[PDB]
Amino acid sequence: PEESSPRRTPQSIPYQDLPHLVNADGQYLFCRYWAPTGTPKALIFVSHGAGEHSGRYEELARMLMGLDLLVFAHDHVGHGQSEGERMVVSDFHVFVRDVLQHVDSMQKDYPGLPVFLLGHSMGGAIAILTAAERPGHFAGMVLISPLVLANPESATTFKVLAAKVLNSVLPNLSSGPIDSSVLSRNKTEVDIYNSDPLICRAGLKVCFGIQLLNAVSRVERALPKLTVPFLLLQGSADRLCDSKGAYLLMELAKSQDKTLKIYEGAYHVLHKELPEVTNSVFHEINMWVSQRTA
Numbered sequence: 001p002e003e004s005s006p007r008r009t010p011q012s013i014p015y016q017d018l019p020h021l022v023n024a025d026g027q028y029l030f031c032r033y034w035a036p037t038g039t040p041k042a043l044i045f046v047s048h049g050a051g052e053h054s055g056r057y058e059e060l061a062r063m064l065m066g067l068d069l070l071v072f073a074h075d076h077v078g079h080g081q082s083e084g085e086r087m088v089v090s091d092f093h094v095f096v097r098d099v100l101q102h103v104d105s106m107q108k109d110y111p112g113l114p115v116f117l118l119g120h121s122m123g124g125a126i127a128i129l130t131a132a133e134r135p136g137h138f139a140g141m142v143l144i145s146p147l148v149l150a151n152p153e154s155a156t157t158f159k160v161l162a163a164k165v166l167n168s169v170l171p172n173l174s175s176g177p178i179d180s181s182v183l184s185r186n187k188t189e190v191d192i193y194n195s196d197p198l199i200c201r202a203g204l205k206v207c208f209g210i211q212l213l214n215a216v217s218r219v220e221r222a223l224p225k226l227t228v229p230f231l232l233l234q235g236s237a238d239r240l241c242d243s244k245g246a247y248l249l250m251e252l253a254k255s256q257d258k259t260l261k262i263y264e265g266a267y268h269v270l271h272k273e274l275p276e277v278t279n280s281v282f283h284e285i286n287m288w289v290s291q292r293t294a
């Protein structure tokens, strides 16, 4: 008997040449690490949003590593360089389970360190659910435009189409894709998003949209259990995650250490917005994590 051909990413790169982790379902997740030259003060997991991937966090990760944190991430199943049918998940909990496996694995290699989470959009719903599953385990969470409440006009349009796939057998159904111009007022960052071949810019598959509605439902039920410290950054003109969700998260979370910063006029991707906003986002995350790792 001979060993089968190396498992490769969806872009045909052997996983044996890349940092990776195999999840509970036997799926390979592509991993990224940014470690300081000294002994890290803390670990921080970066949780990307729907359709994107971990490579989009390069600059934020380098800033965090500059604070002597060991930053780590993986592409969620169905995204980027990880395995899985594109933007499909059997249940939304798979994302949370896989973050927990990676966090548990890193804490074995770097024991006794505080661990933080940083999430954007769906990645912020994943961070919230991860922290609610393990009360008292995480030192803090940084949320950038987390998915807590979808945009009201898009939630109504979807929930109707969703109950049509929920009543019949229609596997290939999909809604329309995101209008990339609403991601950011920074046109260069919108063009970069439109140029990245690791980003899935296809319309949302209805099955996946159902899992996002499950995520929103679960986030709402988790808020009375959420006690982790958090920093919440939200743009007032975000057409993807309505700002009303950020106010509801500040109100309903039980956390004793919660802070909200609103960026007036800003769109969704605050860490890739107009320079004045992006520089503030980086500075605020730096101060917030620096204060909680001293």
Ligand SMILES: *C(=O)N1CCC(N2C(=O)[C@H](c3ccccc3)[C@H]2c2ccccc2)CC1
Residues within 6 Å of the ligand: 049, 050, 051, 120, 121, 122, 123, 147, 149, 150, 151, 154, 155, 158, 177, 178, 179, 204, 208, 209, 210, 212, 213, 239, 240, 241
């Ligand atoms: C960050 O990762 N996200 C991706 C999903 C996106 N989104 C919602 O929220 C809407 C949704 C939610 C649940 C089921 C179906 C659709 C979509 C959306 C919003 C606005 C326009 C187009 C698509 C928020 C950001």
